[PDB]
């Protein structure tokens, strides 16, 4: 196996004080795909000068990210004391197809030093530490987040100047505050800037050595080091796993001042990663050397369709999350928004299913439920819909009545009633869009305003926020064409709005300042 150096000889571990309330801050730093945030450059080829639509692993628009806060440890003001951390080691998430991280989001801003809320300092970029693997469980004292067999550890070291990527069996040490000993909370890594971040001589093993206080490294299959240029530049970094190994991606080597993420390394981990968590970290600084650190944000990746805009230099400088809203689905299909009108039919509202109705001679009350949209199973006949109490149509005693298109019309139940089936009803939608003012209004058609509200629980798209900006202050207005939000009654007559609604109605654009 791989020689990763000796075990720590310390008889005990540093005590770790986990105080989550001090890390309980709100500072979302979301992905805005319109500037291609979080977009990982597609692999295997390149393009330039083009907009394409592509399905692949991407973060989604508006993902704020899980915020990970690293902090100064306890100190007497002369010397460091105990570590001070967030409860991150137990925060085990599904790996699935991977995830991405925003690093240094708050860099160069000034803010809290966390351990002492009234104290602020210039915020520095710190690289995230992770523990990943195929299986997790409990520790011998009942703590969570134990990884089994070989565990992948991503542990930045040297005060953020090297990445140590390794895969070893982590053998817990039994000493005081160690994972197999007395008074264990959570292992956490640390460095001590007073001795570890000396200019020209960083302790490149400071975080490795602290890690080693809690676990011995055994049967290592690998340990690789990557160097990191020290800067405060906003950085994209991320990870995925494929049949060929574990792919480490960053904007750091290819697009440092841009953000497109590119693969820079692959680790030989063929055991599907199912679980991961953030390694808590604390800096053993003193009060007079107490710094603030940027939180990092973790966003998940998933197979999403995006429009990706490639500049002449081949970098993605804009992207569209096609399913984000109704207008965005249209932009992907229609390439852009000023294309013709932007006045197009949009994806409809599904229905929103209710608990089922089941009957079959061969838990309550599922005999019937009237009604809205309920799943059902009746004598082997399945579907979803709303039942209505209605008069019988024949033939009697044959139970299930079907229409001209061979669909179920209704059913004779064992309670003696006949119900008409209307399946589920839905809300059709269309959007009136003005490419000049960059605004819109929407119709629900035939649904009518008695069933319309500014919010919806149906649903047709992930967000309705572009309309809410104005529509949140108006009720729906009912017109002969259909029910509309964002209409404003002005009682005007115009020849052509370039947004006619048909009939004798027209949606008039407002006037640019």
């Amino acid at each position, epitope marked *: 196996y791989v020689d990763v150096g000796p075990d720590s000889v*310390k008889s005990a571990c540093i005590e770790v004080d986990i105080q989550q309330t001090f890390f309980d801050k709100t500072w979302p730093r979301p992905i805005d795909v319109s500037k291609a945030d979080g977009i990982i450059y597609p692999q295997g080829r390149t393009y330039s000068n083009i907009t394409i639509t592509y399905q692949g692993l991407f973060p989604y628009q508006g993902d704020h990210g899980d915020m990970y806060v690293y902090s100064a440890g306890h100190a007497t003001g002369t010397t460091p004391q105990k570590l001070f951390v967030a409860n991150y080691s137990q925060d085990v998430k599904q790996f699935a197809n991977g995830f991405v991280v925003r690093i240094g989001a708050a860099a160069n801003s000034t803010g809290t030093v966390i351990i002492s809320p009234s104290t602020s300092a210039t915020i520095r970029k710190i690289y995230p530490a992770f523990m990943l693997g195929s299986s997790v469980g409990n520790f011998s*004292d009942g703590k969570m987040g134990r990884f089994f067999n070989h565990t992948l550890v991503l542990l930045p070291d040297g005060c953020g100047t090297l990445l140590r990527a390794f895969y070893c069996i982590l053998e817990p040490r039994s000493g005081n505050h160690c994972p197999a*000993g007395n008074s264990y909370t959570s292992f956490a890594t640390y460095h001590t800037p007073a001795t570890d971040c000396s200019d020209g001589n960083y302790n490149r093993n400071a975080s490795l050595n602290s890690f080693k206080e809690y676990f011995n490294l055994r049967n290592c299959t690998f340990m690789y080091t990557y160097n990191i240029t020290e800067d405060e530049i906003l950085e994209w970094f991320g990870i995925t796993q494929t049949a060929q190994g574990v792919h480490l991606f960053s904007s750091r080597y290819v697009d440092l001042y841009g953000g497109n993420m590119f693969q820079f390394a692959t680790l030989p981990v063929y055991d599907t990663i199912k679980y991961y968590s953030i390694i808590p970290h604390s800096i053993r600084s003193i009060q007079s050397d107490r710094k603030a650190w940027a939180a990092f944000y973790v966003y998940k990746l998933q197979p999403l369709t995006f429009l990706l805009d490639f500049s002449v230099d081949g970098y993605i400088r804009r992207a569209i999350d096609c399913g984000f809203n109704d207008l965005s689905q249209l932009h992907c299909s229609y390439e852009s928004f000023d294309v013709e009108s932007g006045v197009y039919s949009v994806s409809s509202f599904e229905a929103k299913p209710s608990g089922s109705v089941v009957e079959q001679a061969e838990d309550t009350k599922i005999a019937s439920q009237l009604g809205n949209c309920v799943e059902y199973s009746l004598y082997g006949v399945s579907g979803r819909g709303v039942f209505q109490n209605c008069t019988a149509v024949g033939v009697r005693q044959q139970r299930f009545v079907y229409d001209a298109y061979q669909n179920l019309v209704g059913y004779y139940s064992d309670d003696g009633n006949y119900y008409c089936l209307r399946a589920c009803v839905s809300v059709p939608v269309s959007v009136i869009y003005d490419k000049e003012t960059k605004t819109h209004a929407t119709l629900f058609g035939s649904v009518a305003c008695e069933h319309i509200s500014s919010t919806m629980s149906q649903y047709s798209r992930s967000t309705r926020s572009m309309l809410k900006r104005r529509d949140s202050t108006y009720g729906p207005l009912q017109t002969p064409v259909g029910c509309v939000l964002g209409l404003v009654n002005s009682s005007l007559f115009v020849e052509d709005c370039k947004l006619p609604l048909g009939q004798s109605l027209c949606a008039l654009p407002d006037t640019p300042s």
Partner: antibody, heavy 116, light 103 residues
Framework: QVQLQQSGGELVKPGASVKLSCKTSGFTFSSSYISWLKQKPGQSLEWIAWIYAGTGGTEYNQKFTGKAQVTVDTSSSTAYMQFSSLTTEDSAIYYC???????????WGQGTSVTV | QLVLTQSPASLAVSLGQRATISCRASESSFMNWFQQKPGQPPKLLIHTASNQGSGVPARFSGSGSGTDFSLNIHPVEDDDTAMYFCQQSEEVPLTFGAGTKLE
């Protein structure tokens, strides 16, 4: 009052195994580290192993690996030290103590005399 | 582990007099002192260079840092005839020095 009570001694031949024990009281066994040490007359003391009774976690002195096993039975508040394949160089007084890791050894058993 | 050297090898101190016993580490501060009376296991006297152990008389006062540690027994009783040892608990394997004989 904390007490550590060891078993009496024994005479064995080389190749023999011996099992030592140390029953303790006056403290919670499961909250303490119990260390085992080897000492010969005229010599300093050498630590063999410790066990945290509360987790069963252990640590050993490499000169005894493959020969020594430290274990506990918390239901009887007892620490044990098992040795196998003893040689004449293992004739010693074996001691149990309350302490281990970073904890100083405040309480000791009387010592168990094993002659090989 | 850490190797410890003690000095003096032995010392005679009369009743009512102070006994100074020193230890020097080969390297570097959780140094503990023990007293092993003839026929007894070692008892802890000092821990973490200067603190008193459990049930330990004020007569036993320690100090030290780095590689250099000491114990001052004052007054010495005839009943303090014992081996005095330094032990290092900072690192594992835990170790004891050769010992100083106080008479």
């Amino acid at each position: 009052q904390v007490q550590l009570q060891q078993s009496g001694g024994e005479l064995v031949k080389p190749g023999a195994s011996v099992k030592l024990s140390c029953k303790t009281s006056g403290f919670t066994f499961s909250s303490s580290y119990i260390s085992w040490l080897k000492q010969k007359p005229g010599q300093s003391l050498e630590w063999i192993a410790w066990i945290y009774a509360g987790t069963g976690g252990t640590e050993y002195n490499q000169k005894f690996t493959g020969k020594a096993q430290v274990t506990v039975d918390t239901s009887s508040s007892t620490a044990y030290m098992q040795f196998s394949s003893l040689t004449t160089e293992d004739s010693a007084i074996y001691y149990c103590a309350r302490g281990g890791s970073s904890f100083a050894m405040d309480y000791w058993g009387q010592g168990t005399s094993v002659t090989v | 582990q850490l190797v410890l050297t003690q000095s003096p090898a032995s010392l005679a101190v009369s009743l009512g007099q102070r006994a100074t016993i020193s230890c020097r580490a080969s390297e570097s501060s959780f140094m503990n002192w023990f007293q092993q009376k003839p026929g007894q296991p070692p008892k802890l006297l000092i821990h973490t260079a200067s603190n008193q152990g459990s049930g330990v008389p004020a007569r036993f006062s320690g100090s030290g840092s780095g590689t250099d540690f000491s114990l001052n027994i004052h007054p010495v009783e005839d009943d303090d005839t014992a081996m005095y040892f330094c032990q290092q608990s900072e690192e594992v394997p835990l170790t004891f020095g050769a010992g100083t004989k106080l008479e």
